[PDB]
Amino acid sequence: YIKAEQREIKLRRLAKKRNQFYVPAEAKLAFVVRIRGINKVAPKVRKVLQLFRLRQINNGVFIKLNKATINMLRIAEPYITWGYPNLKSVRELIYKRGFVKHNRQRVPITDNFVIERKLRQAHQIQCVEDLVHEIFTVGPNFKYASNFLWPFKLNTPTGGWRKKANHYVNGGDFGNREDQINRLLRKMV
């Protein structure tokens, strides 16, 4: 993780010195949290929300940023605010807010051991933090890891703008606000 921050910083440093613009690798991994209803929602979007598992307002899941997913988030836009989550934020969410799906039932965590509990077959994953590595990095067992978490259910952040249903451009909320989510998300936990 620490090395990962240094690689990005150094690429930027070396380029700019050589006159070169190295434009840094486009972001993987989004966190999606539900601002909207369920009631007074169009059915296309209602269906998309169930599949995401986002059952209630301010419940949030991690969703792999793919060409597949991003189109569902587009029809879901006025219903969702989403961004790129920092590692601090993922760590704050799992340890306090992170429950497990074991035969329906939504089951604590907090133990390393209960995360070893399943995910040791997805090797090198025997810890609470090792689950968040897998989420963060979009590791190959992301399907099961994301599934294992039952949607984290998160208070409200902080003064969350009256206009609500406007694209983030318009001062709204709703949008891929990019890196500005880190301020939001950390406060909402």
């Binding site: 690429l11 190295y22 434009v23 486009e26 972001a27 993987k28 793919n66 060409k67 597949a68």
Partner: protein, 158 residues
């Protein structure tokens, strides 16, 4: 009250579109249709025998019968409301092989090549199709000169 006959709204469904006019040229038959192959139904209105009833145009089925001058294609058609399966006997003059299936077959052969190639490289396979990810650290070199130019606008003019 209503629409109802069979040919309702089929002015443009059964229209031969400009410069494709006349007698259905022989290649259509030459294609061998074999049971279990995926077929698309495209209404050719110049071949008036074995007409695929208007709901079945661009609804595509798999072949479960080959009969002397008809191909019986099982299209699954959404009813109000219980998806019943219909065997429609339609002619090859209206029946064109879907190359939706070939994409699958091309994949088997390609997957087997990648598998073999990887195994002879020792490691690693990863032959499953991943959709276009947010890519890469992109370096733009001037070359051929720095950028910049902004834009617009005087766009009056009625």
């Amino acid at each position: 009250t209503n629409s109802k006959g069979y040919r309702r709204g089929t002015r443009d469904m059964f229209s031969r579109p400009f410069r494709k006019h006349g007698v259905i040229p022989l290649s259509t038959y030459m294609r061998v249709f074999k049971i279990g192959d995926i077929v698309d139904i495209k209404g050719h209105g110049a071949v008036q025998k074995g007409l695929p009833y208007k709901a079945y145009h661009g609804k595509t089925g798999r072949i479960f019968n080959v009969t002397q001058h008809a191909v019986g294609v099982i299209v699954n058609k959404r009813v109000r409301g219980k998806i019943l399966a219909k065997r429609v006997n339609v002619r090859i003059e209206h029946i064109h092989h879907s190359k939706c299936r070939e994409d699958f077959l091309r994949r088997v052969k390609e997957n087997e090549r990648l598998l073999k190639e990887a195994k002879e490289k020792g490691q690693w396979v990863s032959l499953k199709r991943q959709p276009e990810q947010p890519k890469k650290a992109h370096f733009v070199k001037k070359l051929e000169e720095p950028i910049a130019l902004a834009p617009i606008p005087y766009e009056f003019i009625a």
